[PDB]
Design a protein around this ligand. Structure first.
Ligand SMILES: [K+]
Ligand SMILES: [K+]
Ligand SMILES: [K+]
Ligand SMILES: [K+]
Lengths: 263, 283
């Protein structure tokens, strides 16, 4: 949709692509050394072993000054240079820190290793026709206090928050089948493939939890369409018992769904 | 005189108040912060120059006794620039050179900690409607206000609070400001991206049931709005505040549909009319 309506720097800095970010920084960096060279130059021949007036001699000097490399070939002369050498060194620090702050922020974006089942199903469970889909954790580290939100979307556009058998799993480690008993209170009570489509119904799934791996929260999203609900489907058990009498988890069949056919 | 600024901020004059450093360091303005740091930095080199000087002529290629020669020296020492023209001499300088370098590190880290802290503040891009309304919806007179997300990145698990704040008298005849948490049709929106009209059905349970412009005003009633949610842009939480007065509720107002069709046949959200409110008039 067409939105009718610098200024938002911290956001843009984080949002912008990695390449763009590196440029914006290289730019700010090249530029400030360019201002510091114009300073050293503006004091007269204040740098030693730099050609008189030569901007490029003061640039490389300022670089190894803000950058504290300090080769020694080009040193400052007097109180003037030695005071732009003092401030400029402060700017390198102030410079670096902000960089690292942003570098840390954009970098430390943790991602849930969560895999969503490609389809949903509606089949009977505990007597009631129940809407189901399932999640699986792609990593070893466990997600504590996971919890899922199952939201229906349809035209009437309205959001309905579908009640779940289990809204939150205190320890999500392997797999988790989420379930919405369709009882007389379900927004989709007596609904049907046809009726569902007519309303343009979609399904939003929201996952979050604490990730032990990162020691921070994570979030995952996914959305299904009527198209993607298998009426009467049952998710294939994804847990085996190997030769060795041990239990195992086969994600190979994570999106497998069983169904019965006749005429 | 309003009790709560449009801000969310409370409009009230307080009274009767290195002691709170971490707070002040974060709170102070950016310019003041840079000064406080430039000050601490200039000062410590000034103490290290008085040290090198206090050992005798311990720096090479520095004029004897000259404080300024040891200042620059100490600068390029704490700062590790290391030109080399002025080097330390003996065990004394070379041991203030060892500690002073430790301080540059300890110095830089704290700086960065604070720099990171003050800098890493995400802001919700949320826009609050300038006014509220009370008009019929689904039969019931319903209190409404609306929010818009000024960015593209969506806010997930947004959720909103609508707080009445007004003066009441206890049964023991006692006047105080109470806050009421107004029940919303929708308290949370799982995905907030464009616009959102928040609604409090005024039913027989509403703290403002049967209330009216006049009665509202007598009680000094105000409305606090609190918004929070996860911002996909920052990958962190955000929060927004705002507050209205009775003055700012339009009875019988309806918010102008803010969803347009441009000349493309294309669907557009026009924030231009975000605070537009329609109203009937009499005689
Ligand atoms: K260095
Ligand atoms: K360094
Ligand atoms: K160096
Ligand atoms: K050197």
């Amino acid at each position: 949709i067409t939105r009718l309506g610098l200024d938002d720097h911290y956001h843009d800095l984080l949002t912008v692509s990695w390449p763009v970010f590196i440029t914006l920084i290289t730019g700010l960096y090249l530029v400030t050394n360019a201002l510091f060279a114009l300073a050293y130059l503006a004091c007269g021949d204040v740098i030693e072993n730099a050609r008189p007036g030569s901007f490029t001699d003061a640039f490389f000097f300022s670089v190894q000054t803000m950058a504290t490399i300090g080769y020694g070939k080009l040193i400052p002369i007097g109180p003037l240079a030695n005071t732009l050498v003092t401030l400029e060194a402060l700017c390198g620090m102030l410079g670096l820190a902000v960089a690292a702050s942003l570098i840390y922020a954009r970098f430390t974006r943790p991602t849930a290793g969560v895999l969503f089942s490609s389809r949903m199903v509606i089949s009977d469970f505990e007597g009631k026709p129940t809407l189901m889909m399932r999640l699986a954790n792609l990593r070893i580290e466990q997600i504590i206090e996971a919890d899922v939100h199952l939201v229906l979307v349809r035209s009437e556009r309205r959001f309905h928050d579908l009640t779940l058998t289990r809204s939150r799993s205190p320890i999500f480690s392997l797999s988790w089948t989420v379930m919405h008993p369709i009882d007389h209170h379900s927004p989709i009570y007596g609904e049907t493939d046809e009726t569902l489509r007519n309303s343009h119904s979609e399904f939003l799934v929201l996952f979050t939890g604490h990730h032990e791996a990162f020691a921070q929260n994570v979030h995952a999203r996914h959305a299904y369409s009527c198209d993607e609900i298998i009426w009467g489907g049952h998710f294939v058990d994804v847990f085996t018992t190997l030769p060795d009498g041990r239990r195992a988890l086969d994600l190979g069949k994570f999106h497998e769904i069983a169904q019965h056919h006749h005429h």
